[PDB]
Design a protein around this ligand. Structure first.
Ligand SMILES: Nc1nc2c(ncn2[C@@H]2O[C@H](COP(=O)(O)OP(=O)(O)O)[C@@H](O)[C@H]2O)c(=O)[nH]1
Ligand SMILES: [Ca+2]
Length: 168
C-alpha cells in the first residue's frame, strides 16, 4: 500500500490533536495532553485506492532542533494549523512554514494552511481574506475546519494526501 506521511504542525491549542482524533476516531476530544506527540495510522480509500495514512501529531516539545527537523524531514505533507480565534497562532504559521522549507528544501512540499475552529465565527481574530492572501503567497490552499463539528476534517487530510500522491 501507498503510505502517505502527514505531519500536523501549528502553535499550541489550535486543534492539531482535535483534528487528528476527529479524523482517526470520529470523536471531538477536548482535553488531549498539550505536550504529547504521537503518531496514528489507518487505512483509507483515497479516490478508490486503498492507502495508509500516517499522521504525526506534533506538540512542539522537541525543542531540540535536530530532533524537530528529523521529524519534519520524515514527513511527506503538512497540515499547518492555526486557530481562527487566535491571531498569534496565525502569525506563528510563518515559522512552521520556514521550518518545513529548510528541511524539505522544496517550496512545493505538500502543504495546506488550515484555519481551525471555524465554528467559533463570533470569536474570529483572523480574517478569511488575510489567511487566503497568505495561502496565495505560499501557493497553498487554505481550508477552514472545525474539529468540533467535523467540517472539512476529511477534506484537509484527503486533499493533503492528494498533493502527496501527485507531487512525490
Ligand atoms: N470550538 C472548537 N474548539 C476546538 C476545535 N479544535 C480544538 N478545539 C479546542 O481547543 C483546545 C486545544 O485543542 P488541541 O487539539 O488540544 O490543540 P493542539 O495543542 O493544537 O493539539 C481543546 O480544548 C479543544 O476542545 C474546534 O474546531 N472548535
Ligand atoms: Ca496536541
Amino acid at each position: 500500500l501507498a503510505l502517505h506521511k502527514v505531519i500536523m504542525v501549528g502553535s499550541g491549542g489550535v486543534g492539531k490533536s482535535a483534528l487528528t482524533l476527529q479524523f482517526m476516531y470520529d470523536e471531538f476530544v477536548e482535553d488531549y495532553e498539550p505536550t504529547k506527540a504521537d503518531s496514528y495510522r489507518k487505512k483509507v480509500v483515497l479516490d478508490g485506492e486503498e492507502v495508509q495514512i500516517d499522521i504525526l501529531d506534533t506538540a512542539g516539545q522537541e525543542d531540540y532542533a535536530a530532533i524537530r527537523d528529523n521529524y519534519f524531514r520524515s514527513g511527506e505533507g503538512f497540515l499547518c494549523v492555526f486557530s481562527i480565534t487566535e491571531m498569534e497562532s496565525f502569525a506563528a504559521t510563518a515559522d512552521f512554514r520556514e521550518q518545513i522549507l529548510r528541511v524539505k528544501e522544496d517550496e512545493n512540499v505538500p502543504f495546506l494552511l488550515v484555519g481551525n475552529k471555524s465554528d467559533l465565527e463570533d470569536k474570529r481574530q483572523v480574517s478569511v481574506e488575510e489567511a487566503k492572501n497568505r495561502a496565495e503567497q505560499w501557493n497553498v490552499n487554505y481550508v477552514e475546519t472545525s474539529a468540533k463539528t467535523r467540517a472539512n476534517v476529511d477534506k484537509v487530510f484527503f486533499d493533503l494526501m492528494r498533493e502527496i500522491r501527485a507531487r512525490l
